[PDB]
């Protein structure tokens, strides 16, 4: 767990799609999604395992 893990499903307001993983703190798990590129947050991982290893464990 890390402070930024609380940040929500922040796709960010750009018109791109880059498959990433974030932690839905409002559920309590790491989930796949598409990031845009712009205006995201720290709650963003290329792998489930890095998300998991950051927030879970």
From Swiss-Prot:
Changing residue 27 to K: Decrease in binding affinity for Kv. Expressed by the venom gland. The keyword Isomerase does not apply. It is found in: Secreted. Coiled coil: none annotated. Residues 5-55 form the BPTI/Kunitz inhibitor domain. Disulfide bonds join 5-55, 14-38, 30-51. Changing residue 24 to A: Slight decrease in binding affinity for Kv. One of its GO terms (cellular component) is extracellular space. Keywords: Disulfide bond, Ion channel impairing toxin, Neurotoxin, Potassium channel impairing toxin, Secreted, Signal, Toxin, Voltage-gated potassium channel impairing toxin. Changing residue 15 to Y: Slight decrease in binding affinity for Kv. The record marks 3, 6, 25-26 as: Important for binding to potassium channels. One of its GO terms (molecular function) is potassium channel regulator activity. Belongs to the venom Kunitz-type family. Serine protease inhibitor homolog that selectively blocks voltage-gated potassium channels homooligomer Kv1.1/KCNA1 (EC(50)=0.6 nM) and Kv1.1-containing heterooligomer. Negative results: does not inhibit serine proteases and voltage-gated potassium channels Kv1.2/KCNA2 and Kv1.6/KCNA6. This is Kunitz-type serine protease inhibitor homolog dendrotoxin K. It comes from Dendroaspis polylepis polylepis. The chain holds residues 23 to 79 of 79 of the full protein.
């Amino acid at each position: 767990a890390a402070k930024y893990c609380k940040l929500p499903l922040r796709i960010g307001p750009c018109k791109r799609k880059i498959p990433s993983f974030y932690y839905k703190w409002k559920a309590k798990q790491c989930l796949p999604f598409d990031y845009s590129g712009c205006g995201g947050n720290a709650n963003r991982f290329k792998t489930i395992e890095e998300c998991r290893r950051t927030c879970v464990g």
